[PDB]
From a paper:
As the electron density maps show, every individual side chain of [name] is well-defined in the high-resolution structures for analyses. Despite [name] sequence differences within the binding groove and differences in TCR recognition, the structures of [name]-B57 and [name]-B53 can be superimposed remarkably well. We show that CTLs derived from B53-expressing (B53+) and B57-expressing (B57+) infected persons at a time of viremic control readily recognize the [name] peptide. The affinity between the C3 TCR and [name]-B53 was 2.45μM when measured at steady state, but there was a 120-fold decrease in the affinity of the C3 TCR to the mutant [name]_S3T when presented by B53.
To explore the molecular underpinnings of differential cross-recognition of [name] and [name]_S3T restricted by the two HLAs, we next determined the crystal structures of [name]-B53, [name]_S3T-B53, [name]-B57 and [name]_S3T-B57.
Residue numbers in the entry:
A (entry chain B): 0 to 99
B (entry chain A): 1 to 276
C (entry chain C): 1 to 9
């Protein structure tokens, strides 16, 4: 049927400050149908402790979810979100940019 | 301000992988307060906000019964929808529903809602009169005739004007420290050169509740809608939301640009600029 | 408080 691909934002709960504990978020939205696979990556590797919100949807019926993990940002460590969905030929990886 | 209560249902078939999953979530404004998931180890209505925890066992039992019954009803609705669209039993399909009540600032019923979708497309909706239906296609007209015959709209009207409004007002009182508190955005403008002759100005709004906000850029006092990059409002994880709006401006023209913020938590609309 | 009305398609 008609399918919608996810939008992806990767960001922190609070302004990034190296050495200070924080939360790393991957917000996926705008997608249909609801099955979706989301991993958070720390230097390429899947973080094991990741929670997510309860499925809900927007007024246009598209779904959204927040995936989140506690993290302590540094200058060297790189974070990303990896998303798979039926609309994607291959998983999409969005790198965390502390200015966006 | 104004307030709303909404329930969101999603029922998802999955041939070969069991019976369809049914999930229900309840919100007051942008605050989730209950969830039910038929795939849980022990499916029951679960609290998602501190102010709902005080409800007594009669409350949890009534809502859990409703959601268990809905699980069965929407499994049958998914089977019926296959017949209405001549579809095979091999595919996965989704029914979604959102219903609830809006209050105005006085606290009276402003309007009620009960709208449903099939595979992410509008299917049927209760009209604003709470007495008639709008069907999106000839399958939903079959449903419409059934609900007209059963006077479903009269029952929904009684719920939307009665129990929905009464219990929304109750939750607003029990959760007044949070549900009736608007947190205004913390705002600032950042500056990022994109070249020797252009730079991005990004107007940030952080830490706000509820989610509704307007962020706009003006150049020489004229709205820059077409040239403005506006991200979707996003949850921070602590109940609050975030948003930004960005424009690419000629270097040396930054002070011709102003960012305008409207939010319920602000006594007056805010105007800000890049402060080097 | 959820609605108890049955919506049979």
């Amino acid at each position: 049927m008609i399918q919608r691909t996810p939008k992806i934002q990767v960001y922190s709960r609070h302004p990034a400050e190296n050495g200070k504990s924080n939360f790393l978020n991957c917000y996926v939205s705008g997608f249909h149908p609801s099955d979706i696979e989301v991993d958070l990556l720390k230097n390429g590797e899947r973080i094991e402790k990741v929670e997510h919100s309860d499925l809900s949807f927007s007024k246009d019926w598209s779904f959204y979810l927040l995936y989140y993990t506690e993290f302590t940002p540094t200058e060297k460590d790189e974070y990303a979100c990896r998303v798979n969905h039926v609309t994607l030929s291959q998983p999409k990886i969005v790198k965390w940019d502390r200015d966006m | 301000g104004s307030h709303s209560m909404r329930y969101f249902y999603t029922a998802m078939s999955r041939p070969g992988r069991g019976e369809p999953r049914f999930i229900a979530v309840g919100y007051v404004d942008d605050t989730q307060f209950v969830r039910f998931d038929s795939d849980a180890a022990s499916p029951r209505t679960e609290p998602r906000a501190p102010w709902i925890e005080q409800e007594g066992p009669e409350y949890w039992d009534r809502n859990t019964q409703i959601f268990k019954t809905n699980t069965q009803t929407y499994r049958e609705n998914l089977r019926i929808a296959l017949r209405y669209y001549n579809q095979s039993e091999a595919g996965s399909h989704i029914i979604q529903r959102m219903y609830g009540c809006d209050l105005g600032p006085d606290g009276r019923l402003l309007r009620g809602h009960d709208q449903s979708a099939y595979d992410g497309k509008d299917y049927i909706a209760l009209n604003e009169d709470l007495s008639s239906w709008t069907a999106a296609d000839t399958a939903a007209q079959i449903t419409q005739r059934k609900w007209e015959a059963a006077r479903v709209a009269e029952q929904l009207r009684a719920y939307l004007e009665g129990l929905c409004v009464e219990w929304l007002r109750r939750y607003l009182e029990n959760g007044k420290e949070t549900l009736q508190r608007a947190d205004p955005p913390k705002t600032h403008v950042t500056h990022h050169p994109v070249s020797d002759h252009e730079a991005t100005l990004r107007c940030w709004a952080l830490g706000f509740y509820p989610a509704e906000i307007t962020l706009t850029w003006q150049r020489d006092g004229e709205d820059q809608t077409q040239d403005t990059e506006l991200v979707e409002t996003r949850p921070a994880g602590d109940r609050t939301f975030q948003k930004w709006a960005a424009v690419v401006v000629p270097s040396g023209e930054e002070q011709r640009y102003t960012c305008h913020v409207q939010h319920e938590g602000l006594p007056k609309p805010l105007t800000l600029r890049w402060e080097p | 408080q959820a609605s108890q009305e049955v919506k049979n398609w």
